[PDB]
Design a protein around this nucleic acid. Structure first.
Ligand code: MG
Ligand code: MG
Ligand code: MG
Ligand code: MG
Ligand code: MG
Ligand code: MG
Ligand code: MG
Ligand code: MG
Ligand code: MG
Ligand code: MG
Ligand code: MG
Ligand code: MG
Ligand code: MG
Ligand code: MG
Ligand code: MG
Ligand code: MG
Ligand code: MG
Ligand code: MG
Ligand code: MG
Ligand code: MG
Ligand code: MG
Ligand code: MG
Ligand code: MG
Ligand code: MG
Ligand code: MG
Ligand code: MG
Ligand code: MG
Ligand code: MG
Ligand code: MG
Ligand code: MG
Ligand code: MG
Ligand code: MG
Ligand code: MG
Ligand code: MG
Ligand code: MG
Ligand code: MG
Ligand code: MG
Ligand code: MG
Ligand code: MG
Ligand code: MG
Ligand code: MG
Ligand code: MG
Ligand code: MG
Ligand code: MG
Ligand code: MG
Ligand code: MG
Ligand code: MG
Ligand code: MG
Ligand code: MG
Ligand code: MG
Ligand code: MG
Ligand code: MG
Ligand code: MG
Ligand code: MG
Ligand code: MG
Ligand code: MG
Ligand code: MG
Ligand code: MG
Ligand code: MG
Ligand code: MG
Ligand code: MG
Ligand code: MG
Ligand code: MG
Ligand code: MG
Ligand code: MG
Ligand code: MG
Ligand code: MG
Ligand code: MG
Ligand code: MG
Ligand code: MG
Ligand code: MG
Ligand code: MG
Ligand code: MG
Ligand code: MG
Ligand code: MG
Ligand code: MG
Ligand code: MG
Ligand code: MG
Ligand code: MG
Ligand code: MG
Ligand code: MG
Ligand code: MG
Ligand code: MG
Ligand code: MG
Ligand code: MG
Ligand code: MG
Ligand code: MG
Ligand code: MG
Ligand code: MG
Ligand code: MG
Ligand code: MG
Length: 61
RNA sequence: CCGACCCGUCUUGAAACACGGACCAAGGAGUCUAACACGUGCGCGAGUCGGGGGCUCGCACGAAAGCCGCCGUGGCGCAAUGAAGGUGAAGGCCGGCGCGCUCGCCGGCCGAGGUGGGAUCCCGAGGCCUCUCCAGUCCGCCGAGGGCGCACCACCGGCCCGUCUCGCCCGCCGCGCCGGGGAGGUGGAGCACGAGCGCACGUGUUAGGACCCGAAAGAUGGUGAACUAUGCCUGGGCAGGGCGAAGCCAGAGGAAACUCUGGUGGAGGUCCGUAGCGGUCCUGACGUGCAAAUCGGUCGUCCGACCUGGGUAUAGGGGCGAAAGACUAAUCGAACCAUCUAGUAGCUGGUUCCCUCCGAAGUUUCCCUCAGGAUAGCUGGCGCUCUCGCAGACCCGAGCCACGCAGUUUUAUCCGGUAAAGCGAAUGAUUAGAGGUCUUGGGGCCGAAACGAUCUCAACCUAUUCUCAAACUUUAAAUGGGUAAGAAGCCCGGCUCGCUGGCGUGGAGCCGGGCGUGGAAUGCGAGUGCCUAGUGGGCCACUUUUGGUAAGCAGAACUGGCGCUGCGGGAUGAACCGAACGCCGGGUUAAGGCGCCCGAUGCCGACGCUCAUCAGACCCCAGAAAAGGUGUUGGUUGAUAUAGACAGCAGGACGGUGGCCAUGGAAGUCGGAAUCCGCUAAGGAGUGUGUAACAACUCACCUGCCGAAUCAACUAGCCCUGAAAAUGGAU
RNA sequence: CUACGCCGCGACGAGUAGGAGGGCCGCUGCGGUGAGCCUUGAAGCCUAGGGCGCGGGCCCGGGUGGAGCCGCCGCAGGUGCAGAUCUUGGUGGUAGUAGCAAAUAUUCAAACGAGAACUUUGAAGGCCGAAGUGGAGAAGGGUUCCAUGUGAACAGCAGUUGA
RNA sequence: CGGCGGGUGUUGACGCGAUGUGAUUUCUGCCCAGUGCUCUGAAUGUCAAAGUGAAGAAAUUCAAUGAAGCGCGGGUAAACGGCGGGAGUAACUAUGACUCUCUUAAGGUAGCCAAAUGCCUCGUCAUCUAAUUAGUGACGCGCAUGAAGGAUGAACGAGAUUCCCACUGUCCCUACCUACUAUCCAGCGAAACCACAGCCAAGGGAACGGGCUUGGCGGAAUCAGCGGGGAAAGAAGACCCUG
RNA sequence: CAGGUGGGGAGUUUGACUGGGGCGGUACACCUGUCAAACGGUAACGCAGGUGUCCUAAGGCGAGCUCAGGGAGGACAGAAACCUCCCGUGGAGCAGAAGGGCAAAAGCUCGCUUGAUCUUGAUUUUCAGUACGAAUACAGACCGUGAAAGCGGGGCCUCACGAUCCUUCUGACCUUUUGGGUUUUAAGCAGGAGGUGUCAGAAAAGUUACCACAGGGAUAACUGGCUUGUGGCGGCCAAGCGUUCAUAGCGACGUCGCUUUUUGAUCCUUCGAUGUCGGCUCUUCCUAUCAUUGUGAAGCAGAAUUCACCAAGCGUUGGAUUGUUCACCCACUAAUAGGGAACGUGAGCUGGGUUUAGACCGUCGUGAGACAGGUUAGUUUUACCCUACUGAUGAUGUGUUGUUGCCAUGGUAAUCCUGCUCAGUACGAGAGGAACCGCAGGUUCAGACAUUUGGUGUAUGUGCUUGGCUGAGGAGCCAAUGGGGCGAAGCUACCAUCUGUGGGAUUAUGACUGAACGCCUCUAAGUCAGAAUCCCGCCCAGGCGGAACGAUACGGCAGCGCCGCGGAG
RNA sequence: GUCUACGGCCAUACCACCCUGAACGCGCCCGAUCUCGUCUGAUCUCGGAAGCUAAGCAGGGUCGGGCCUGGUUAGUACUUGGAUGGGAGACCGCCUGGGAAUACCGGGUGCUGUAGGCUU
């Protein structure tokens, strides 16, 4: 009739059998969720980043 | 000799007083079809596939195999997106004019962009050679650095379809409520130089009998009234007695009315009681029977609603019922037969060869969910992407030493409100005095009179005081949780922006360049994908912990274990202690032991404690408390004593005063208070016994004998009392 | 050096539910193959016989048997049993046991016969006691009726008797 | 199922059909609010299809009209059923003849009772006995009696109960006898049941062992009994829960 | 065809959790504090509570103020009316439960308003990292307020809520409406609403004792096990009672235990079944002893009684009522003690009760039906197996066989009362009133026995007798023992009769001597007495235990014993 | 050495009382025509400059309260890990590491940024 209601016994062992892996950190974290206004200006900056290539190459030279 | 409980099964737990199993032989349970998904093998490959048809002596095989190609119709793939109308996946650079106006017409190129990683490949300064050198003949190896970068991953851009917001243009045989564009967000199972198709095999899920066996039921169509129930037809049957209804006859008594008496008669759902029919009690017999309802005795009725044969009628959700849900062929709260039907089952039982490797869960969320599923977790299988190097034919390295990871520490840096602590800190609770001056405190001895007064109790205030808190708190641990400890870092410049803006401002992005002592310890090779079974009843122990008197109770946290696990020890034992396991030999241990059972103390083991007429004897653990002991052993504190202890024996133990008041006597001793002095060595105006009260004993106080240590109160070891249960018995 | 082979070094080995691999483990049938085996003896069965393998299992000897069978490479299954109050068949212990006890009752002699408690005849003693244990029918049975013969089985002992 | 089909019905209210109660005797009280049943529509509320009218191009929409039924209103309790409270009130208290009220409608009349109906209860009182949770009689604010069923009343009953006489082996308290068994023999010859089996104490253990541990111990093969055990057999518990 | 009626009939349903289920409750969807063990998470029908709403302002801005309370003043005015000053860290208020938060605030009073509006995404919370709900940060419009910075897309924060399908409304000069076109209609796209509270969301009343099936010891009713609140029985302290005096006998306030003979709590075993109350019968065990034996104490003069010790050997009864266990009464008694053994005991019985099916009453229910309410009637099966036990043969071994024996071991048995005498004695003022020895008998029990008395009697012994039968007499028989009187033997009855037993060590206890502790002391060493107990005797059986003794195989080849170390094996 | 305006940290800064304040400043102060608000020019707003440090403010003082920081409390309480340690239990001791809080007793009583003044 009545049964055990809840337990976390053995759960920690189950969690550590395959290890509790941290999230896979890597370069270039995603841009989703960032402020839309700042994001659209960043897109504009990237689009127009091509112009001034001659100036950048002359300065580098 | 040692070890050894009976297997299977469900179960937290089986040798179980849990179920199945007397024995043996043969049979006996995950199959086939279809549809999916993924993996693997094969062929072809932007294709692929003839499976349906046809052609080929119509045929032993051959119902096969071979071929078709204007039989590829068609299926699947090659294009997506939208409800739909419909629409429908190529960018980059280099130039001139419009204003190179976030840009329109073209040119000329290349043909899916870029960043960071990236196996492999390429170049490579410099090194390696011999009998030797100044000077080159040719190829092999190592090699710092640099380059092109597969697949794949992360990110940023771009393209297609839907849908919003904004805004300016363009096109025309239809100038329109027409058509087409652009920018910025956002929705898509998309594009971004295809990977599919067919066949085979495996695994998983599913629909089908669906691993095998199993309901109570439901439906369709039939067979039964030979038993019984009831109606009808036509037959048969029921000793002997008792009571004595109406009708009738006679006699008697009566003034009459009429009454009485004796016969006769033979009624009755009448009585006793055969046969018949039934079936009360013995709760008799029997109870694997004579019998799937019988037998013995005892019983009910026995002229009637009586018993009975045969013939008939009523048939299943129907009949029939003097009614019990009774009876309807040993079947009735819905007969029997066949079929649908191998009905369904979240439930029970079973489920067939060996070895090897890996190896669980009883938890999360949802469910008319609680004996079940889905889901995540735990498992297995298949891989794939990388890292370290592999070394020298034998021999022989010639600061600096892998991508990365972690149930760990260290170094910094945060987080917390438990334990503890606190209440002369807040909020609640709570004890006691003290000191104060006001009051709707009671009031308060003589004060109405100005309580002339000021004594007391309250409340209040002040400074203290005792005790507390899971749902209080100033303070505040231990254990714990997060982050960081570099090349994705640090530092220099430069470019872009429509965001931001006093500003060469801020911020973000991008492009070059330089920095390597690789910036704690320790250990370890990592990353990533697909498919996936079983499980989803748990239980136990230390510690924390809630409810409960408690529980071998119920409920949580942490870790470990049992389940799933054998072995050594605990005599015995799922969980305790040690330790985890291939088959063996030698050595040594753990926990635990070493009188004998029974391996080992058969040591000239050490020091003590302890006697029990219920001794004691080892984690869990299998039994005990308060309170006692002049049993004994230690210890603590105090006290006395050669100015003579303690104990024994022997002396004294006096006056006021028979002290005050209680009285009926209380003289030291029933009592209420007081609590002295003189003689002293000592004497209490009294320790108890005692008396009516006295008296008499005796103490507390001194003295004599005795000559050396003694007394008291505690304390904690072992032992004893406390300590009573049922078959005879358990270190 | 059967490269699906051979060799070397190091570490490791518990296991239910469950997953996977290997099987020169086993059964049946099909395509190949063994110039396979076999009446000078196949399958099957039995065996204090000899062995191999961790094991599933297998080979060989002896006996019996009397006509078919197996190895290897592939293929395909109605392919492996201790259980299911399993299905069918057979067999034990129980066990020479329970039992052959309702309705009073048999005895003597003889015959037949291998054989007599049970048959038949005779003599006794009893019972049913006319609402019968008597004599005849209906339903139902279907040859049980009646003679002769047999002594297998049946008549829960026997039988010379019998439905 | 169906036919103007069929049963009652070869019938006709002294008859068929449907109910309740249950001979005789004696009574059968109050309640029509509820639920039923039934009766008249009295304007009258609601109320389908069809039909009618309007709008519309039509589909369609709207409106009017209003069958039965329900609703409204009467009757009905030998229809189902129900028959409680509260306030005041008599010259001892106490009760309430009397007067009012509330829920609905009426408040349990006549009778009967610790009854086969009463919990408390083994009620209280009388009787019966030495002793009575029994019996009878009586009382009655009766948990929760009661009138087509109440209260009686002869006869009857394989109905339930109590007492008395007689009678007895029911008992004190058992014994003996008979028949058939059982028993033994000749013949014949099953079945149930069966993991293996079968001596105990304690321990631990699924918390009551035949097996295990520690002890006690253990001597072929059997016969007649016996009913302590085998948590004996018989049946997949019928109680309880779940599905 | 339409409407009404329609359990006459059909089909179906009649939640879940749950210290069994039902009744109760909601721990079923949520929120606060605690539990919770200082990150987060964490359970029980854990604790204290709350929720299914309310608000055009209680939403949004801005401005200005300060709240609760207290002190001191002021006509009525007082503890509370209003006015003024001062103190006032919030001790108030913020809609509600609680917690957090808040002072020129988030509170109060005003002014203006509608950001409680139109949109796309992201994120947090529960989480599977699904949804809903709620929430956070942005972005794009359109606004409100303020001088402005700013703030606002509901409420200071933590809760206040809801899928598919369907319906309804709103929006796009939107899409489709099937050969084309127009118009109604319908379908669609996007967003609100109508709701599932069992709150991830079926459309749902009972009863069954006439019942059924698949199961469950996952789960109750009876045993057992853990526990011991409750029940029962004890202990410690001693305020008091006891004329006096705590403790002869008691024991308040407290406090420590034991028992499993009560009742609970739990749910470990059993649901392919462990027969469930009581009585009857019978055995054994416990002691917490009612009586009896031996004792100690007293508020013990005697008698009677009370308390305690060793102690379970022995006994603990006959009846009325009731099914009863209990209970109560009558009567006897030495006493009429309490318990266990699967609440001992159903293949031992009985079946009164509970607890099937029939039936009546009362109450409940519309009804079927229900009722730890009453009443009545209601099938009690099997042993032949194994062991246990009771008896009965046997078996091992001594060469065979017999007689006579011993005793290991096991069992074990006696009990209680009355009368006389002691003795009208001790004691006592008196009334009353014992005991030891001895004697005579009983009760219960045991073991026998049959002379006597009684019972039986099928000696089928002998008379009598009924009905029938053999022709009658005589003699008999049949009637399941025809009936009846008397009856031998045998068996048998407290229904007759006989018999029933000694010692030892000791317990409790009282003592001796005697230290410890120059005293005392039953104790420490050493001694004594001492009992229904214990052991043995007497009595019953006689070991896989012995002893002594006897006889030990032919009238025929036939066996055996002793002697020999005699031999060969 | 100070002040003013705006501040940062937010008591070492707060609170109670007393003393001192030169120069600027900050204030008190005067008034209501305008701006603007009131029951009230008290507040708010505005226009001023006779007087004053009386107050605010600043500095100082108090065996001051508080606050801040040390000591003591105390290696105490508590606690990680361990034992076949003790005890009938309740609980306690030890090993291994960590380690508080009152009461009581000391010291301290704002630091500072920007901009602008005064102080011989
Ligand atoms: Mg569970
Ligand atoms: Mg099972
Ligand atoms: Mg279980
Ligand atoms: Mg088992
Ligand atoms: Mg058991
Ligand atoms: Mg079972
Ligand atoms: Mg069986
Ligand atoms: Mg079987
Ligand atoms: Mg072909
Ligand atoms: Mg085509
Ligand atoms: Mg790349
Ligand atoms: Mg992208
Ligand atoms: Mg799948
Ligand atoms: Mg099947
Ligand atoms: Mg159905
Ligand atoms: Mg018939
Ligand atoms: Mg008659
Ligand atoms: Mg009669
Ligand atoms: Mg019977
Ligand atoms: Mg019935
Ligand atoms: Mg079936
Ligand atoms: Mg649901
Ligand atoms: Mg199960
Ligand atoms: Mg907390
Ligand atoms: Mg605390
Ligand atoms: Mg406090
Ligand atoms: Mg638990
Ligand atoms: Mg398991
Ligand atoms: Mg494991
Ligand atoms: Mg193990
Ligand atoms: Mg062991
Ligand atoms: Mg042990
Ligand atoms: Mg070894
Ligand atoms: Mg040992
Ligand atoms: Mg040894
Ligand atoms: Mg003791
Ligand atoms: Mg293994
Ligand atoms: Mg098969
Ligand atoms: Mg087989
Ligand atoms: Mg078999
Ligand atoms: Mg026999
Ligand atoms: Mg017999
Ligand atoms: Mg006769
Ligand atoms: Mg005849
Ligand atoms: Mg014949
Ligand atoms: Mg025969
Ligand atoms: Mg009638
Ligand atoms: Mg009408
Ligand atoms: Mg009327
Ligand atoms: Mg009345
Ligand atoms: Mg009554
Ligand atoms: Mg009665
Ligand atoms: Mg009686
Ligand atoms: Mg009466
Ligand atoms: Mg009436
Ligand atoms: Mg035993
Ligand atoms: Mg079952
Ligand atoms: Mg069943
Ligand atoms: Mg129905
Ligand atoms: Mg924690
Ligand atoms: Mg926490
Ligand atoms: Mg404000
Ligand atoms: Mg906005
Ligand atoms: Mg739900
Ligand atoms: Mg259980
Ligand atoms: Mg108690
Ligand atoms: Mg007194
Ligand atoms: Mg449990
Ligand atoms: Mg049974
Ligand atoms: Mg069983
Ligand atoms: Mg039994
Ligand atoms: Mg005793
Ligand atoms: Mg019993
Ligand atoms: Mg029995
Ligand atoms: Mg029985
Ligand atoms: Mg009965
Ligand atoms: Mg009944
Ligand atoms: Mg009867
Ligand atoms: Mg026999
Ligand atoms: Mg003896
Ligand atoms: Mg005796
Ligand atoms: Mg005669
Ligand atoms: Mg004669
Ligand atoms: Mg005759
Ligand atoms: Mg006769
Ligand atoms: Mg006689
Ligand atoms: Mg006698
Ligand atoms: Mg003594
Ligand atoms: Mg002596
Ligand atoms: Mg100070
Ligand atoms: Mg420590």
């Amino acid at each position: 009739a009545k049964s055990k209601n809840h337990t976390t016994h053995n759960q920690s062992r189950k969690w550590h059998r395959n290890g509790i892996k941290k999230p896979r950190s890597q370069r270039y974290e995603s841009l989703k969720g960032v402020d839309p206004k700042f994001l659209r200006n960043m897109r504009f900056a990237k689009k127009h980043n091509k112009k001034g290539l001659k100036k950048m190459q002359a300065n580098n030279a």
